[PDB]
Write a protein that binds this ligand. Sequence first.
Ligand SMILES: OC[C@H]1O[C@@H](O)[C@H](O)[C@@H](O)[C@@H]1O
Ligand SMILES: OC[C@H]1O[C@@H](O)[C@H](O)[C@@H](O)[C@@H]1O
Lengths: 299, 299
Amino acid sequence: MMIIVGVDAGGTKTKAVAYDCEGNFIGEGSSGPGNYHNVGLTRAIENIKEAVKIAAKGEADVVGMGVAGLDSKFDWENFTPLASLIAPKVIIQHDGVIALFAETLGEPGVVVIAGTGSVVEGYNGKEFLRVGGRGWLLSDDGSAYWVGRKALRKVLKMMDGLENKTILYNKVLKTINVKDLDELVMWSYTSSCQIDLVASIAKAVDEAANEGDTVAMDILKQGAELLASQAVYLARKIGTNKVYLKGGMFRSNIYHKFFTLYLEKEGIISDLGKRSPEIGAVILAYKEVGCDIKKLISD
Amino acid sequence: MMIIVGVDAGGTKTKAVAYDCEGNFIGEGSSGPGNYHNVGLTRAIENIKEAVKIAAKGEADVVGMGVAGLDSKFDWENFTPLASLIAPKVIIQHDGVIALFAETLGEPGVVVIAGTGSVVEGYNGKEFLRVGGRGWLLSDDGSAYWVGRKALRKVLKMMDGLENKTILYNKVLKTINVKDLDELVMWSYTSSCQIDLVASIAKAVDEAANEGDTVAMDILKQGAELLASQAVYLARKIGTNKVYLKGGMFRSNIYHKFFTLYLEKEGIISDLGKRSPEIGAVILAYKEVGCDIKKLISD
Ligand SMILES: OC[C@H]1O[C@@H](O)[C@H](O)[C@@H](O)[C@@H]1O
Ligand SMILES: OC[C@H]1O[C@@H](O)[C@H](O)[C@@H](O)[C@@H]1O
């Protein structure tokens, strides 16, 4: 019958899930980044189309998508037209909006997305509010890019002899395949503006942290608390006592722990939640075309 | 007679001073950035040639230059060949080396350059040692770029309502001609990789600081201390009780004050010095070709 696809077009990757209109799962698909600021509009759209095609096993009737990078009116006006050519019916929203809707389903609340970039999104019963979520230079506190940059800067200070070399040191050098200061410099000058390459270093930080390296742990702690502070601010403003946590950074057990500890000390409850942003997009699509959301229930 | 030109090819601008071989001043000239990482090799060389031509009022016989951006073997091998076509005799060194030589004239010591980028350079009697000075992404703590980025990130948090808007807020918006969050985002996406545009914001921070804005002062303090800590490390390693301070950031009275206060609390004496990096290059050229450095003395 009808094929409805929900999509999370993020900075790290694009994830899509397809369902019919009767709540039944059809399939899933993944592709590259959906943030056009990082891969360009042509490729971002191509990646979304690919993820959708894979999940639907062909053409889709309705596509709902949460998108990273729609940070200005300019961003929206150039993205919308192209994204609408993907299927007969297409629904587009900022990724923070979809991630939050996926969980609160129309009710007030706050969600945090911590992936290649980051954002805190809330809903006060009347409108959506955003804190951060404006790119790597201006924002993205506690994101993978933010963590990767901090690690790179720390590694140089270790090479300079300013600080002792820790586990993090070799984890980073191996990740980007660099053996000395000279190679690190060259890597930086040709990788400086490639957000994905810097963000990829967050994995090295997580590995070093899991092995007890306080230097790596400090980076994760600072990033998590910088972002968590924004979540606490918005939660208090909206009047909610809980915040939902989504994104690849929360797959870092230590990062997640520092984030939850901060929220808890500030009287806020954290919840990873049961609903992904992509299924949130499916739900929004269901509402748009009239499919019964309760049919998605399964056990 | 013989025309000798000393050049400081930095991240902010290129400055040149011409003298004959008898210690007499001929003229000075300025042009754009000499750091090829920021303007490309073609333009960097063009800027150096222009500054030299202006100062010498024509062709020069000898050109000595301190250059920002020679941070790897790769950088040197591509820069040297072109720079040698500027005059019959050309001497090339990293800018930190020349800035330090200008003051200690062959003796051990430590110098700090804080301009668009930053670096701490020392000499232990046998070789030159560098700390930092590897570009905007990996380093440049307390540089104009570093300060500009911190200001931009703070301004967004003010727009988000996370912190109260201070004097700094409007100083920044006016500097980059932006009126709201939407325009700031667009500016960021088209100015993100233009180091000069981000570094230009340091002026706004200085203005706000001079007017008593603690938020702007905090940025200058953090940057100055991050860089000053590196200077203290190198001064102690080399065994010197003083550090020379050079660069446009020291024209910020508050930045300079925070820098000197930190050094002093750590038992180190600061000195702006009497000799510029460009005259340091003239002195090195004098040594190379056999002109008497003492002839430069004047009153
Ligand atoms: O995906 C999380 C956030 O990442 C940031 O880099 C983007 O600018 C935001 O639009 C997005 O919400
Ligand atoms: O000019 C100060 C420093 O600025 C940095 O951006 C450059 O990478 C260094 O080579 C230079 O020494």
